Design a binder for this molecule. Structure first.
Ligand SMILES: NC(=O)c1ccc[n+]([C@@H]2O[C@H](COP(=O)([O-])OP(=O)(O)OC[C@H]3O[C@@H](n4cnc5c(N)ncnc54)[C@H](O)[C@@H]3O)[C@@H](O)[C@H]2O)c1
Ligand SMILES: NC(=O)c1ccc[n+]([C@@H]2O[C@H](COP(=O)([O-])OP(=O)(O)OC[C@H]3O[C@@H](n4cnc5c(N)ncnc54)[C@H](O)[C@@H]3O)[C@@H](O)[C@H]2O)c1
Ligand SMILES: NC(=O)c1ccc[n+]([C@@H]2O[C@H](COP(=O)([O-])OP(=O)(O)OC[C@H]3O[C@@H](n4cnc5c(N)ncnc54)[C@H](O)[C@@H]3O)[C@@H](O)[C@H]2O)c1
Ligand SMILES: NC(=O)c1ccc[n+]([C@@H]2O[C@H](COP(=O)([O-])OP(=O)(O)OC[C@H]3O[C@@H](n4cnc5c(N)ncnc54)[C@H](O)[C@@H]3O)[C@@H](O)[C@H]2O)c1
Lengths: 331, 332, 332, 331
């Protein structure tokens, strides 16, 4: 049994609990956030995007019990003050968005935790892993690691397949992304000074920056410095699409590209020929779902520009990858 | 030339500035918030609901200039620390949502301001004004006042007209309300513990509490304790509807009720027979817009239940009412 | 083993199919619509509100196979031309919205069908059933019956409980309703000339008329002519709320009313004290979900006004009620 | 100049809004499938473009706008309309069903002198993007096309790019507001598109567009050099055209932004403000280049260039349409 704590019971943290609660390999001992147990339990029970929790929840003072299993609730904003050493937690899932670095997240280790998995990009001085792309880099000795971004978990398998089959010279990624909690409800100042994430999330197409493409080198070293891109946040509650426009080493046809993708398909990376829309990927277990209906190739003179697209649920896809990586790290 | 400050450059503060900036009676000296001048200027220039500002904005350091007039910007979370005295500010529009009480809002007076107008309900010990309903209660000597809530400004003229013409013994109010910034973007803990405002604003029907009906007595004393109600927040960016289901002292007809409403119509209280929808009231100047097409009467054993509905833009309707009450207060 | 055809593979039809593949008592022989099998199969596999279908779907010329069982696809706009006798269908689920009457829906019988369940109000010359309110009236002699409206399936159990415990003299219903396929995507002319459903569905609060309250007289005869109401369509994809403001024959308390509701709770009528929002009822099997957090009472001069509310998934709640009524009709 | 409108839809009603205070045209008639009460109500109130600034009165079979009367008809077949009896000078074909010379010429048979089609209508006629190729107009044209909204956004941007640096090839992606050809909720679709069948306001909906492939009709040098697709997202109006392209010359972000600013005109605007989609609702530009979204990535000696332009797919296109209308009749 592996003792896990969750710091930051948000979209990712709560969905992580949903994925770990039924699997006997883990024991979620505690959850830390900024609120009381009643609030945490209600948010776990009811979800506007992922549906009702299938199980039973009851709340007790300073704790709540899910499926008969009790979980201590704490409210410490400073991780070094947490009781990880006292409950002897094995791994902390750092899901707050505030401690995404080796320096900052290591406060969990000083608090007594043996290992930490960060739910975001956390710099380049620690292992960053996209499951079924580079999880082989783990040997079990790593105290703090990053599960990368949702967008890298969508893009990496696609870019790796393209590079391995045809060699990818370069490309531009644009992700049409569901809005998230870092955007305002209505136009208002933003905490980090972003004048676009300041705007009403569900009423706008909101251009935004993302480093997923520039940082791919941390996951696929061969592609370091070969991709860039940005995002457009749009008014869907969850569900996103990654488009990649690129040039390859070899002339290709749509059929050849789609076949390479199907051949690279696994549990993390899926393949579909159905003309789906975003609402159809909510809650999927794949980290990436390649959409063969969106493959397009244009040729001028002898040079090809290739466009590919893969769906992902920035919540469920990422969290499933995060739990795959958590299982690998503790094995 | 009245020296105004705005504390909290939010939805209401920015729309207040929009309504005062063309207006010669006010000079807006300062704005206080929690961010820098470039952010306030950007948010004033571009609006997701109220459209782009028609005018020119330039950003200096620590201030910005609107249509050639400079406004100093400050970022002090504690109002008592504000430089209202040194700027000789006459009225502060308290629009943050954090000082809506006599005691808390009086810190502006301690900061050196002469008067404070609060843009929300602020308790029972202060004058609360819905313009063109009870604004005669103002005499000019009041240092702090409340402009009431958006729902109170929509409901009050409707309930006053019904009471005056037919006697309103009791009623229930329901406001189908646009979501606001006190609701979360996606499901998440909520600062004030509301498990319903914690849910994703633009994805849900969210029942919520409101004191607009219970507190109507502060605006229409004859109606103290005769109304109650609640809200349903729904996914529109702005624009709202107040429904009132009530019993009256007098049998009435649809035509009678509608005529009573039109007869009470003014700049604050409007009347329409067009089958409009919420997006059509965005930016209107009325504090309340009675919809004669929604009037319904049901009679059982000779006893009637009456349903009426009035539209409002919870932002522009309220802000226009607030500037009306401000002008009246400083013209006194 | 009862052979069922579905006419109109829409929101109600497709969800009916989702619920009947579970039940071995039915076999769905055919589906009729205005399009091909590829599209019907695709729309059945993927749903923006009710999620992906968990099961297997394959497409065949003029048919598609679900969980290994084949279903015939037809595209005849006129029901009299259907092959119901050839297929010997026992019951047709009439879900198009165009044949909602005894006279029009009897064309299914002329095509050779034994019985018709209309998924909408179909007039007062028919048996209209809200399961677990008046389904005891069914005896097997009925060629055509109506499953009533979604809103009546939400309101009836609540109104019945109120009437049974305390006597319901009169009441006004207001439903806060998800938008539907009879509203336009963007502002445009409307097929029925309604200037409000002509407006952009996902951008507005849209007042609308409904007979759900008046039609309660067909399901609860004691309450004939005692209720009326209206609707407000709001930008959620599915999930709705029914509010009721009413007067009773007896004085009551909030907890007394809530206790009566919990007591009347069953498979069709659910009871909750959780402060839920609309997205939380998507896909529920109840026809009505009474929300104890919304009960309120107003007392003035000793006469009370009572406000209660029930949630419903206007799609799944109604469809589950519809399948319950269909099983009841074919069991007799 | 006697202007009539066939199809009082999103484009038609906004066109009338723009022509009310233009002293050179007077609108004489409007044809649609509904009565004057509905048309007047839809002209008065609009969910995206706000209330009409003016007074509307509805007479018998006509309505008066700001004192000026306009008769209304209900003919689904354009050949049966009384353009001859009304001596119409130019008809705006805005239904979406007669987008071809052969079909739109029925206006000519009813007695219409000139027809401007508010959509792409084939290669047999002049298709014009104002301030891109409008000088091709002389007096002699009875039928012309105003192109698509997406072409009116892309064309000036692509032209500036070609003229300054030479566009080898490019892939366009437009993040587009949903439109009335998408379903409100999931349901069969009349043209069989399984994606436009899905609920418009709940999904990211990939869609095809010919705006890129057809650019050759507006900029002949670029025939067969661009392609692209669309993504429909839940905003009521407002759209963004992103272009990923390769150029003949090596460039810098500053060079591209300067070349765009140099091309600035009433049709093609320039901004460095970090705006969002709702900020372009109702703008008078056919295209608004966004300098904040320019990106260049370089691998070996080869560059990929990304640029983006906003447009209000309704107001931008309609403003362009009436500009082309004025030009067409000046001659
Ligand atoms: N949401 C996504 O789509 C997504 C996808 C991939 C990665 N991530 C990453 O996951 C992390 C969490 O994101 P989220 O979407 O779940 O956001 P969220 O806002 O939903 O979750 C944040 C939670 O952390 C809690 N928290 C904040 N400060 C805290 C502190 N000092 N101590 C304890 N708890 C605290 C908050 O109260 C909130 O409950 C972020 O770094 C995000 O970048 C998010
Ligand atoms: N939005 C409506 O529909 C509406 C209608 C009528 C009244 N009101 C009331 O107006 C008030 C403001 O609401 P809003 O909708 O504009 O909300 P908002 O969140 O958009 O505005 C809040 C603003 O106040 C600022 N702020 C917070 N604390 C501050 C402090 N200590 N000092 C300076 N600035 C601070 C924030 O940075 C933000 O700019 C609330 O009390 C609300 O109840 C709102
Ligand atoms: N959706 C709800 O919330 C709800 C609730 C209760 C009752 N109902 C009732 O159910 C009925 C269907 O509604 P819906 O929401 O599923 O609408 P919908 O528009 O999704 O379904 C209509 C379907 O019927 C098909 N159709 C139309 N005419 C036809 C014909 N002549 N022959 C064969 N097929 C035809 C259409 O192609 C479409 O697929 C309506 O009467 C509605 O009022 C709907
Ligand atoms: N909406 C945009 O963003 C946009 C941009 C550029 C071009 N267009 C083009 O403009 C045209 C109209 O699009 P829209 O957005 O106005 O759609 P819309 O659905 O709002 O307008 C269609 C109108 O035409 C009427 N109509 C349909 N058939 C008719 C007939 N036979 N006779 C007379 N009237 C008829 C309908 O009643 C409706 O009022 C389309 O061809 C579209 O491609 C649209």
């Amino acid at each position: 049994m592996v003792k896990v704590a969750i710091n930051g019971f948000g979209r990712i943290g709560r969905l992580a609990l949903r994925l770990m609660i039924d699997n006997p390999e883990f024991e979620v001992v505690a959850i830390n956030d900024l609120t009381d147990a009643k609030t945490l339990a209600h948010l776990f029970k009811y979800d506007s995007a992922q549906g009702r929790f299938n199980g039973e929840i009851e709340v007790k003072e300073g704790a709540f019990v899910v499926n008969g299993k009790e979980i201590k609730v704490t409210a410490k904003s400073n991780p070094a003050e947490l009781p990880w050493g006292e409950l002897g937690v094995d791994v902390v899932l750092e899901c707050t968005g505030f401690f995404a670095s080796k320096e900052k997240a290591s406060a969990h280790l000083t608090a007594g935790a043996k290992k930490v998995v960060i739910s975001a990009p956390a710099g380049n001085d620690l292992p960053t892993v996209v499951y079924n792309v580079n999880h082989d880099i783990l040997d079990g000795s790593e105290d703090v690691i990053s599960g990368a971004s949702c967008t890298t978990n969508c893009l990496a398998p696609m870019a790796k397949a393209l590079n391995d089959n045809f060699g990818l010279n370069k490309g531009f990624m644009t992700t049409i992304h569901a809005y998230t909690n870092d955007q305002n409800t209505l136009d208002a100042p933003h905490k980090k000074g972003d004048l676009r994430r300041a705007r009403a999330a569900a009423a706008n197409i909101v251009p935004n920056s993302t480093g997923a493409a520039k940082a791919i080198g941390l996951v696929i070293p061969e592609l370091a410095g070969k991709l860039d891109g940005n995002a457009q946040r749009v008014p869907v509650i969850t569900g996103s699409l990654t488009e990649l426009v690129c040039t390859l080493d070899k002339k290709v046809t749509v059929e050849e590209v789609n076949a390479a993708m199907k051949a690279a398909s696994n549990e993390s990376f899926g393949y579909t020929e159905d003309p789906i829309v975003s609402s159809d990927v909510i809650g999927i277990s794949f980290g990436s779902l390649f959409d063969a209906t969106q493959t397009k190739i244009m040729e001028v003179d002898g040079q090809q520009l290739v466009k590919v697209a893969s769906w992902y649920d920035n919540e469920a896809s990422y969290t499933n990858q995060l739990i795959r990586t958590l299982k690998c790290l503790v094995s």
